[PDB]
Amino acid sequence: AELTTLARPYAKAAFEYAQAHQQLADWSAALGVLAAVSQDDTVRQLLKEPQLTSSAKAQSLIDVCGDKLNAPAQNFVRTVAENKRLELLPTIAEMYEQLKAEQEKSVEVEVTSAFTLSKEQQDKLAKALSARLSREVRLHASEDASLIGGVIIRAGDLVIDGSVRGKLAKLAEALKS
Amino acid sequence: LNPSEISEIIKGRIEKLDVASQARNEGTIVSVSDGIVRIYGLADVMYGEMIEFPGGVYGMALNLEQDSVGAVVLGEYQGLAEGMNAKCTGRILEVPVGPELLGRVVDALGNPIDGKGPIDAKATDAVEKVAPGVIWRKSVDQPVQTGYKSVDAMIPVGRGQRELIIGDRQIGKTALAVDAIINQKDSGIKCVYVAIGQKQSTIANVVRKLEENGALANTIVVAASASESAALQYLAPYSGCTMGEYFRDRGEDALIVYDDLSKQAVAYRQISLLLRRPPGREAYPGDVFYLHSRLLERASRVSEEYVEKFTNGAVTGKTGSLTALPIIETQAGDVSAFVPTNVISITDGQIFLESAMFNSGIRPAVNAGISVSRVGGAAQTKIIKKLSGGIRTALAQYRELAAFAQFASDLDEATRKQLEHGQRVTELMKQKQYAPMSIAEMSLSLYAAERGFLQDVEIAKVGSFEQALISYFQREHAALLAKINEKGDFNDEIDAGIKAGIEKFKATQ
Amino acid sequence: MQQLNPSEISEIIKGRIEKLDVASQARNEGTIVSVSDGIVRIYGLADVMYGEMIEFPGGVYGMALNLEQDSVGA
Amino acid sequence: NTIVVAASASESAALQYLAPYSGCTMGEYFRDRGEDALIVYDDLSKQAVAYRQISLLLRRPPGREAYPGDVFYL
Amino acid sequence: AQAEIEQELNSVKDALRAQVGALAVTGAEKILGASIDANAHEQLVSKLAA
């Protein structure tokens, strides 16, 4: 199975607890610290040792994380480790962030461009995307010398190609055929 | 020959290019194995939709799981790699349709492979369909003539009938179907020939024999040869069936050949076993009957009310039809195998070709004991239905008595005369490849067999007799043959003119 | 990296967030997770024996035949 | 004049699978120095059965009569 | 024979106009002369089509 298929009910249980008890930012910081701690190489070598029990792996992760975990997050760590699902801990955190983006009505949008865009240009693209998607948007701008002009908007699976490289590929397909 | 101004087409293409941004739904390839690609993303894709890959490669979405999309590649998969982009097209799987495909050789997606330029089709239609229902059908009664004496006398095919052609390898299945295609060049019935799993030199020889006999301009050829992907071999009969259904839905008549449905079932078995689906008899999938039955139900005759409903009132008072001739290859005469028995349970009769009659020189090779048509004489013309009542019984009396010719001089009179009539009717049904006969010529041969004008003629001079009789009626009684070739009428005037011409042939020639 | 077991469902996991103790449910009681083709898979029933009768609502009875690590097939 | 190599029925399937190769190495000593040797493998069928046992217990994918794909190569 | 004359001739015209159209796309260096003043115009029409 995929990692998202296995990571779906843990993120849904954590999101339903954090929406029921008004602790959304606490669990988002806790799952971010837990994902980043579980991707470090020394902790990953410790979590693959065969002589350790699952309770000692959960106790080592709780003792490493410390003050960034409240008591239901520690209960969540013991439930994840008892079902042998600790390698899912980045994917769980990512799916939690997706659920929180549907709850606060926001979408994370990546915009790539040929030259640097100013704040007026980002506010203009963000307002057009907020009118189209009916969500508060958050733009993340980046550069690319492969484009000769224009922008490329990526929002989830939605791709809007306004670059002239794509218009050059359309003209090449229109004159080749 | 080549002026420079006629290459200004490029400027006009620049004046019809839309450079506005359009929104797409996109994904990324995760894994490629054996023609099956798993894709992350593509959250708006539909079941059965074409998926665009780079390099002009398309796929079809089969497995819409919650976190991945499985797609089957409609072409060569070996240039596809992890990390490459996938796009939705908005289109359930389509082929171009129209009269512009007549004369052309295409692949399973309608792209031309003959080198004669682009196809300017004005319409596309879906590959996957459900056949029209119970109330929209009409019973079959118009004739389709194959031009063979044994087929048009004994097992007649009508407009809208499904008629299977089944038998062993290399005994003339492609030959009977291609000659049935060539006999439609002046009849108004348009033709589709689908080759599945055949060699390319065999396909090129078939299209050269179609052009040499003047029937290529009436025929669309769809080809998916033996080194293509199994997806295209699986999907080519439905694409050619949509190409025939264009002429079915507008009150016209078409005819399609699937020259191996047995290789299409092998290709669908390959696709299903690579998807790890659990198999049954002969490792075929459980829906393999459904694979043939979704296709052949589309061959039908539809009523005038269906044609008036489809064209929104444009075509009024006309029925349309699509006749099918599927072809099944057997192993050593085993007709009780799983795929042959699945296709018999679907068609309206079958024509069995026997290997022993082919190897003894009885070259159209039709086993009259077990070939049958469910429509029968409702489709036949009047003179052919009247004169073929005694053919099957003469061949029936020959079945067992054909081994008695080594001692037949010490037999009674009725057994000897039944065996002599059986040898004469058996020698009459032999026929060469690429020599079609009209209604009048088969009526002359059937009247020469049925009315006892073969009785004083020996066996080695039967068919030469037939040829000479045809030539005599072409130079003396040509208005009689033009009277018979109108709609196959029979009355006492035609009866008397035929019998007077045959008696003058037997007396003076 | 195996597939999802029948106790990996988010009310059960959210239950374990609210209280880690197994005594949230009694050892003679369980809850139906899944129903398919005469097979009922149940989370809980920690004191059940092989062949023991299980009481469902509506007068329906069942019998446990699979006693797995996380689930009971009846 | 004879070396006898034995891998009996109560020994490990790994030793029954390796015995023909070990006996072949002992026979090849004489071939590589310009002398002549003759070897008898009294059951190659049982060597294939022991290799089938090793391949099925290692969860390698089976084929015809549950033999692995490299039994011809064996 | 006359159909094969026209089909050979059309394959030559299609090959010549295919290589001329493949040469005109490769001359995109005019598009390489652009600055940010046309990029602001391109981002304006990317606003207008959403």
Added chain:
Amino acid sequence: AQAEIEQELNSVKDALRAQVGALAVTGAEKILGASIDANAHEQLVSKLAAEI
């Protein structure tokens, strides 16, 4: 006819080189139309320089 198009091919190939620099300008004015006023100077040089 194959021998005749062999004679005609060189003269039409010499006729096509006077039109391709206009073809790139006709495509480039559709793809980005904000530099159509500058391009009338640019085409007097680089019509050679991109063709070679």
Added chain:
Amino acid sequence: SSGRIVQIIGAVIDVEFPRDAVPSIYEALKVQGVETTLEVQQQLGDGVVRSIAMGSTEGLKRGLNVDSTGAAISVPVGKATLGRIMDVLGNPIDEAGPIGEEERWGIHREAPSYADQAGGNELLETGIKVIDLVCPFAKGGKVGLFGGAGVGKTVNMMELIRNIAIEHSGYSVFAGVGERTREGNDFYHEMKDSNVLDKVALVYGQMNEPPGNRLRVALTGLTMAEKFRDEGRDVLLFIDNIYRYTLAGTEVSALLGRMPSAVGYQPTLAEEMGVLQERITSTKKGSITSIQAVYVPADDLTDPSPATTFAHLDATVVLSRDIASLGIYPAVDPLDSTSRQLDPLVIGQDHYDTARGVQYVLQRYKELKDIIAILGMDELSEADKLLVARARKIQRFLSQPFFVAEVFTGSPGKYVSLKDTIAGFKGILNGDYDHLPEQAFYMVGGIEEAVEKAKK
């Protein structure tokens, strides 16, 4: 409340619902845009049900909203179904307006109880000689017509419809399950032309349909027959291919997550057969006489689908490709066809003794096939030669021209009474027609027509 589509694999769709609003097993669901009906099979947990579509799934995407109807698939029942053609969902497909029904019934219900069963052995004469001889029928009984591809099953059913319609005055339900659309159009126009359409209700789910329609159409036809039975009437139920219900349960079985049984079948094969077949019976309220055609895959009778079908029936008629390859129609193997009405306390001693003597002579003829093939008839003994002669006359006299087979041959059809069949086969077994040639016994009605055919 509303759910969302999370998975589409072929005909099988997974829909996620909220946790306090999960729909029950066999509940109908509706997609909000296209109006595709789904029927719930399984509850997987996590709010997700696994369902089978009653229609085409091309064009459907993940994320579509799905409503629940709160009940099962309900079809119109009663007087208004007569004369009309309907599909699996009860919608009319004959272009004749809406059905003016007064009530609708769900298609899933339990079998009637053991105390509600009705016994009876009153004979039903069919007019066909081999059927009235060796496997006789009863009113309120169950008939299977087993056979391979193109051996006759439909021709025999059309003859059984035509001859059972003579002495029956109630209603009829005809269910086409996975067969030819052209056969449905021919049977409808034949009943409309001869004015018997207003007694017969027609349900059709043919070979052109997606497998949910073929999986559930026989339940709809049986629900209409159950309403006619529970009004206290005597009704006829005809089902062309019951094998095609079973094969539709093959086509969705691995998509429902099941491990395969032997030769790739579904593991719930006998239970789906039992849940369908135990509703077909006569009760104490009213009676159902049922005729069902049963397909045999690759001519193998030990294939599990006919072998599970055999114990659900009162009378079993097995057809043979070898007997039809000899030219004998209706092609019934007399040594493989049994019925429970072949019993001396039902039919009498004379008819039973004639049937046992016919089966004895054909069994001893079947045991001599290889020695007749190798050495010939001449090296038998004299009583063996006489029994082979009487056996070939019995085999020729078991054939019969049919009224529905008049298009195939031109010979007129025959109706033979039971008394003439018993008297003719008794006269062949006693030696009264040892001077007749054997080809005079072929394709005649009575023994007197064989007497007139012998003088020709």
Added chain:
Amino acid sequence: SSGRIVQIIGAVIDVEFPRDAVPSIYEALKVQGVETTLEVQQQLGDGVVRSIAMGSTEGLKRGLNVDSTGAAISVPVGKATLGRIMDVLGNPIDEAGPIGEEERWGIHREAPSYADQAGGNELLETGIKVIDLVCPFAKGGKVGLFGGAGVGKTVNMMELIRNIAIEHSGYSVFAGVGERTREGNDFYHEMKDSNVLDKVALVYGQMNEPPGNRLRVALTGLTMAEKFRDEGRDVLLFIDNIYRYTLAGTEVSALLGRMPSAVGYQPTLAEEMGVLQERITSTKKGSITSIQAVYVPADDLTDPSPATTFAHLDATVVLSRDIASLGIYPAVDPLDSTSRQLDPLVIGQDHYDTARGVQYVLQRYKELKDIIAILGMDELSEADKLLVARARKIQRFLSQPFFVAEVFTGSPGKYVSLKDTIAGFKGILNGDYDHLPEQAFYMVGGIEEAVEKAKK
């Protein structure tokens, strides 16, 4: 960028790469520090490719660096391959230095297209009389070759190599699929002693090699034959067993864990046969004609491996022990060998009438030989004795001396044109040479050499 070995299970090796540098399907990979080549079969995801090793994996570990070549397995092509033995990678396995090639080609390509087919049914003249009379070969055609061992298969192959090199200015490629090492060394020394080694390129994929080598060795030999076809020539391609190619596909598909098809075979059986056989065609530049020896499993012609192979074959040549015991060489059965080119539309009426007359006279002699064996020569009539004399003259005129068999016969070899074969066998069939003795017709070329043989 390079990758690392993450898994070694047998010959199946998984190698992990960075995510922007995953190599293509069928790309050749090289293990650093070792002489091991891998061929990519599948892309599993997360940068990991699953591949088959083209040698022994003993001594390999996880963590070894693996370089990608950027292309498929590339073999040397051209005139430098002639006279040389090569493996599947094109490396020389004779001890004669490097191949001095000018060009290397990859072994995976498509079939020639529909517009690239040459057209017609042009015959390939072999110069052998029984082959050019009874079972004629097509340019671009495929020949099944049947028979056991010791009846002259290798001598027929060397005579076809010598005839296509000297009389038609073409070349030959041998591909030994599952080559026994003893017989390959014997075949190499037999081709040195018959002076035909420099006319043929040899590629062996031996029996003790892992089955991807035995799968791709025919593609290697077909790539060298394609370069020889693209120099404007007519090429012969010999495949030693096509069933070992099919079985190597079965073994490679079993190692990758694919679900097997009917009678144990790979589910891509027809596709892997078609990728090899559709590249052997006649194109507009030149042609490749293939001679492939066929093993039949369990003497079953309806087994899936010969049923997939016989769909591509255009002719069969059957070798017989009984013709070779009579001293007649080559030992081709004229009654059991078939051809699709033996058809009067293909070769004309005259060649067809001569070949069917020879086949009728030999079939009538075959049954009259049993008549003479059962009752003696005095049972036959004057016309039967005349046919026996003409048939023995036909049977001895089918023999022919070969240029590669001059040690055996003690005679010069002969090349016979097709015109002389039809004229000579027509001259025997019309009774023009009944005055000659039968021993003049043994081991000559044309009919005139038999005429000058009957003066001595």
